[PDB]
């Protein structure tokens, strides 16, 4: 509705020019239009002038032979007017719908390139919401409010130029509503915005109480809170009741007030005009023409103010969008090497990592994993074993220290090669709204529809896949909502198989998993891990026993390291972390 505050544009002219570059390849087509609006706007201010003549010429001196000469002049001007409106709109449609097609491409690509940090820091909704609105604001102004503004400038000056060269006295009588219109509109537009917000406050509070109470309804009854919740609602509703009224009056008094200006105009043009015809100073046709300009000084003036603000808000939305297009992207340094076929050894040398750079997350983490070795990562919430994953795929970079796979530092390996030799299954697995086959194929593009079946067989997933309504071609709508969590985990495992990595990071949940699938997924973990280095964030007893190393973690520090029997025999933080679990 009402705008909150004028946009804080960091040098608009700079962003204006850059914006003025997106519509450079269609300049000729843009200049063609800008003269259509012109002649359509002029032809607009003409018609009330011609009807003045037709009255002065054909009607008053009865010369109705001259009639069809005039009614052919108008009748064609009309037809052209609606011929330009069509073109100066249909042309603008494809042109403006083309500009924002590009920005969608460009934005979405930056999404693919920008650090995983920008995603991790801000909620997903708030970014789509603000981007998609800042794009619509660009589209709307471009394919409407620009030409709607410009047009009304012509039409305004046009209808004024003409108005004065016919008669000045009357011109000063009718333009004496432009002081009224602007005085009214602004008074009324203060109160509206004030109350619009005052209301938007109380009301958003109300929907808070509403959305939150419906979500945790279960919890409201369990505690008997009904009367108390009711009273909390009630107090906010009687509040809303009083403001919503003030907000509603003041936002709907302009049309009736604008009509009042539209009729006061029509009465000075009839009262002075008709008293200027008695003095033989103007003609009746002349009166009819100014009636044709009376309503050209109210809403058209209002459409002018609002379209300006809409442009202004679009310039700011540009500046936001431009900045997203200026974000740095991930680049593989020119020296970056392709991964030589190694069984994959990993080594961290005194690594320190902080997300916010103020609250340290990892401290001096040092170790070395040799090929074919299964390693276990144990520790509480904030242990820092969940942060390891992102540093081995180099989604984030190490503040101090260095990581390296097979000797070579990760920050000097190709991000493309790196992530191919390293596969990954997470607790929060991700599937796609495509068919089943498409999901499993995703890891390996050039996969056959036999390897998919064959590799689905080994990992126990092929069974339930063939029991799904559409079989292997079952669309997983809403990302597998109609699937058992075990089964989803099973599928996510099978697709990491086809990507045939030489290093595998794992993280298998156990919580909404039925025991039956549980036997299946742990068997599949097995077949996935053989012939592969496997660092594991384990939640199972059957993997921390048969592990080849166990790095116990705490406060982002390495408290212990060794095998099962040893770390129990040391009776340290592992022991507590073990015996107060499986004891």
């Amino acid at each position: 509705g009402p705008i909150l505050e004028k946009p804080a544009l960091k040098n608009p002219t700079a962003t204006l020019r850059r914006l003025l570059g997106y519509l450079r390849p269609h300049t000729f087509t843009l200049i063609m239009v800008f003269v259509f609006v012109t002649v359509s706007s002029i032809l607009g201010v003409l018609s009330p002038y011609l009807i003045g003549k037709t009255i002065d010429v054909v009607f008053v001196p009865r010369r109705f032979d001259l009639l069809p000469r005039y009614m052919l002049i108008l009748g064609t001007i009309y037809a052209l007017t609606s011929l330009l409106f069509w073109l100066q709109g249909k042309i603008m449609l494809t042109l403006s719908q083309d500009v924002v097609f590009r920005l969608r491409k460009e934005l979405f690509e930056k999404l693919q390139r920008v650090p995983v940090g920008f995603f991790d820091r801000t909620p997903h909704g708030d970014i789509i919401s603000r981007v998609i609105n800042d794009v619509d604001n660009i589209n709307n102004v471009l394919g409407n409010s620009i030409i709607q503004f410009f047009s009304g400038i012509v039409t305004l000056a046009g209808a004024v130029i003409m108005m004065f060269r016919v008669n000045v006295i009357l011109s000063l009588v009718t333009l004496s509503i432009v002081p009224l219109t602007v005085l009214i509109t602004q008074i009324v537009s203060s109160q509206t915005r004030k109350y619009f917000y005052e209301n938007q406050r109380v009301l958003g509070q109300l929907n808070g109480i509403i959305e939150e109470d419906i979500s945790g309804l279960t919890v409201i009854k369990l505690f008997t809170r009904e009367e108390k919740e009711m009273e909390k609602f009630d107090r906010v509703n009687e509040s809303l009741r009083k403001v919503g009224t003030k907000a509603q009056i003041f936002s709907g008094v302009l049309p009736p007030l604008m009509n009042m200006v539209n009729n006061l105009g029509f009465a000075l043009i009839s009262g002075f005009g008709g008293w200027l015809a008695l003095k033989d100073i103007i003609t009746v046709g002349t009166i009819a023409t100014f009636i044709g300009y009376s309503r050209q000084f109210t809403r058209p003036l209002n459409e002018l103010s609002n379209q300006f603000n809409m442009i202004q808000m679009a310039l700011a939305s540009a500046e936001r969008i431009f900045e997203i297009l200026d974000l740095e992207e991930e680049k593989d340094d020119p020296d970056a090497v392709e991964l030589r076929e190694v069984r994959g050894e990993i080594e961290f040398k005194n690594v320190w990592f902080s997300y916010d750079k103020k609250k340290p997350v990892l401290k001096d983490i040092t170790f070395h994993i040799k090929p074919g070795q299964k390693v276990a990562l144990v520790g509480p919430t904030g242990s820092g074993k969940t942060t390891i994953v992102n540093l081995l795929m180099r989604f984030y970079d190490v503040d101090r220290g260095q990581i390296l796979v097979d000797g070579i530092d990760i920050r000097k390996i190709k991000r493309s090669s790196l992530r191919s030799s390293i596969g990954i299954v997470l607790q929060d697995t991700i599937l796609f709204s495509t068919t089943v086959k498409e999901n499993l194929k995703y890891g390996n593009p050039g996969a056959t529809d036999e390897e998919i079946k064959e590799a689905a067989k080994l990992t126990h997933s092929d069974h339930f896949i063939k029991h799904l309504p559409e079989g292997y071609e079952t669309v997983l709508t809403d990302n597998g909502e109609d699937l058992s969590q075990g089964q989803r985990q099973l599928l996510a495992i099978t697709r990491a198989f086809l990507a045939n990595p030489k290093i595998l990071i794992l993280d298998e949940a156990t919580c909404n998993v039925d025991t039956k699938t549980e036997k299946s997924i742990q068997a599949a973990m097995w077949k996935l891990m053989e012939g592969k280095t496997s660092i594991i964030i384990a939640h199972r007893l059957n993997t921390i026993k048969n592990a080849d190393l166990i790095i116990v973690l705490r406060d982002g520090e390495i408290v212990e390291m060794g095998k099962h029997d040893e770390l129990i025999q040391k009776r340290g933080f592992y022991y507590e972390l073990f015996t107060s679990q499986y004891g």
């Binding site: 249909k90 097609f101 491409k105 419906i214 009509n259 992530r419």
Partner: protein
């Protein structure tokens, strides 16, 4: 069958406001329809007759009419605002008071997302529809019809032209509507797909980036983006055509008023000024008609909301307390299930079936099972949140159905796996069990729950600020904050769901240890799928596929209960 509840009840106490509105509107329409007539008379009786008095007097008279229509229009906006607002409050309050009495059976019927959108969006949609009816559903049809009557009264013969301007437009409107409506849907379809693509590339950035397949999503986004460019360039090419066509006809009928009006002045039937007037009334009919066009398009949608809002008021509460129900001063805490058969939706398979067990006051039973074994139905059955199809649920060998709910439920605390906190301070949230609870009482239970340390590491500690739904805290912090809030209640039955598993840092075991110390004189169920979680418990109820598999200790169960061996084999 359905319900006889009707939104007209809510506008009824404000009927004074609802008639003053359209009446103050007819004042405006008349005031608006008088202006062109007084122009013909200005010329056809005053310019063309040399009376300055006439022109002066009917010049003044026009001002006085123009100001009246404002008092009219403003007045009709002040009143229809009072009416539409009051109405909205009242319908919204009744709606909320309905969702407060709903049960789990009800909040499953409408989905919970929908329930909200009705209680918010729809209440405002209807609130608009009322405002609309009371002012421009009176304005637009009077200006239309009134304009025609004036036209005809000016000169019956020229009116014939109305039968050649009015049907082409009404055809234009219907044709657009029947042909535009499926294409704007086709826009929403393609918008959705763009949203979908962009979302999944944010939700799953870490997968597609890892699988070196970003370009497949660029290919996947192009299909969305092109499907959107086409669905819009089409549906908006109609609009961009209809409007200018509409203006032409409106303009082409102007021609028919000057042409045909040129012959009526000749053949001495029609004054010159009455042609001027006639043109104005021609306009006031043609744009008014267009307003009526826009109005209907609003009605059909606003219509849908009135259906959904009516549903929520015609829904009946699935859990009713008997008129002569027993009060429960205290509760010992025995908990028994005779032949309970339970099912959430009347289409699926029984989540429970012939479930039998009994628990003595103060027991610490572990309700072990995998997901789907109906273990988690306990939470919803013991406090009467759902009634079972067959079987009784009993608390203190009383049937649950037979006792006052505020009594029964005030003695049970549940700690569901999905938890919800409410906008205020933490100390306000925790006192949800008892308002008269003292700081020490609150801290006692916060400590057992393993959260007093974290809360106290906050700038304002207990008086720290909780944001809506508990969005500011972590899941595990919500989990324990919910446990601490359960424990302030002094429940006689206490139901915790150790499922899902989130979260544990070892501090889980610390909680169950501290529970023993205060469940002293209180029954406690603990729904888990973890064996070690079931070993602290004095006894283990095992559920498998809705039937009880075994009710006893680890060793007994290790023998018979084939489900329990199988589970035990999965974990160890």
């Amino acid at each position: 069958g359905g319900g006889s509840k009707t939104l007209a009840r809510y506008l009824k106490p404000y009927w004074i406001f609802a008639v003053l509105a359209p009446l103050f509107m007819v004042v405006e329409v008349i005031s608006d329809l008088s202006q062109p007539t007084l122009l013909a008379r200005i010329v056809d009786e005053g310019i063309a007759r040399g009376d300055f008095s006439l022109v002066l007097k009917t010049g003044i008279l026009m001002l006085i009419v123009a100001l009246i229509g404002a008092v009219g229009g403003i007045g009709s906006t002040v009143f229809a605002s009072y009416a539409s607002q009051n109405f909205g409050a009242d319908l919204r309050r009744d709606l909320f008071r309905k969702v407060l009495s709903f049960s789990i059976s009800n909040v499953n019927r409408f989905h919970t997302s929908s329930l909200i959108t009705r209680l918010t969006n729809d209440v405002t949609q209807l609130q608009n529809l009322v405002m609309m009816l009371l002012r421009i559903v009176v304005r637009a049809p009077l200006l239309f019809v009134g304009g025609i009557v004036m036209a005809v009264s000016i000169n019956v013969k020229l009116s014939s032209v109305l039968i050649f301007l009015i049907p082409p437009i009404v055809l234009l409107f219907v044709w657009l509507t029947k042909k535009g409506n499926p294409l704007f849907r086709k826009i929403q379809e393609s918008t959705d797909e763009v949203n979908r693509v962009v979302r999944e590339n944010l939700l799953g950035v870490r997968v597609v980036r890892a699988f070196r397949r970003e370009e497949y999503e660029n290919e996947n986004f192009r299909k969305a983006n092109e499907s959107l460019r086409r669905s819009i360039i089409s549906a908006f090419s109609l609009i961009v055509f209809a409007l200018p066509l509409f203006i032409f006809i409106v303009n082409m009928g102007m021609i028919a008023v000057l042409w045909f009006g040129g012959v009526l002045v000749r053949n001495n039937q029609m004054e010159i000024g009455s042609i001027m007037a006639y043109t104005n009334y021609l306009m006031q009919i043609m744009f008014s008609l267009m307003m009526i066009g826009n109005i209907l398009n609003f009605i059909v949608r606003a219509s849908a909301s009135a259906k959904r809002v009516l549903e929520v008021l015609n829904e009946k509460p699935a859990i009713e307390e008997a008129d002569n129900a027993l009060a429960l001063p205290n509760v010992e805490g025995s908990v028994s299930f005779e032949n309970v058969e339970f099912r959430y939706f009347e289409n699926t398979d029984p989540v429970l079936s012939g479930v039998n067990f009994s628990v003595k006051p103060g027991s610490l039973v572990a309700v072990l099972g995998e997901t789907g074994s109906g273990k988690s139905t306990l939470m919803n059955l013991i406090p009467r949140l759902i009634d079972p199809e067959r079987g009784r649920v009993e608390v203190d060998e009383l049937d649950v159905r037979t006792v006052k709910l505020k009594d029964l439920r005030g003695h049970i605390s549940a700690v569901p796996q999905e938890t919800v906190l409410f906008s205020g301070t933490i100390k306000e949230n925790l006192k949800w069990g008892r308002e008269d609870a003292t700081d020490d009482e609150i801290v006692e239970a916060a400590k057992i729950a393993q959260i007093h340390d974290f809360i106290i590491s906050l700038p304002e500690g207990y008086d720290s600020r909780v944001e809506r739904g508990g969005r500011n805290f972590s899941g595990g912090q919500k989990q324990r904050l919910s446990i601490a809030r359960a424990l302030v209640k002094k429940p006689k039955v206490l139901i915790l769901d150790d499922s899902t598993c989130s979260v544990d840092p070892i501090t889980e075991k610390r909680i169950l240890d501290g529970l023993k110390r205060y469940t002293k004189g209180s029954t406690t169920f603990i729904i888990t799928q973890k064996i070690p979680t079931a070993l602290l418990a004095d006894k283990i109820l095992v559920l498998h596929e809705g039937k009880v598999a075994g009710f006893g200790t680890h060793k007994e169960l290790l023998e018979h209960s084939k489900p329990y061996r199988e589970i035990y084999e999965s974990q160890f």
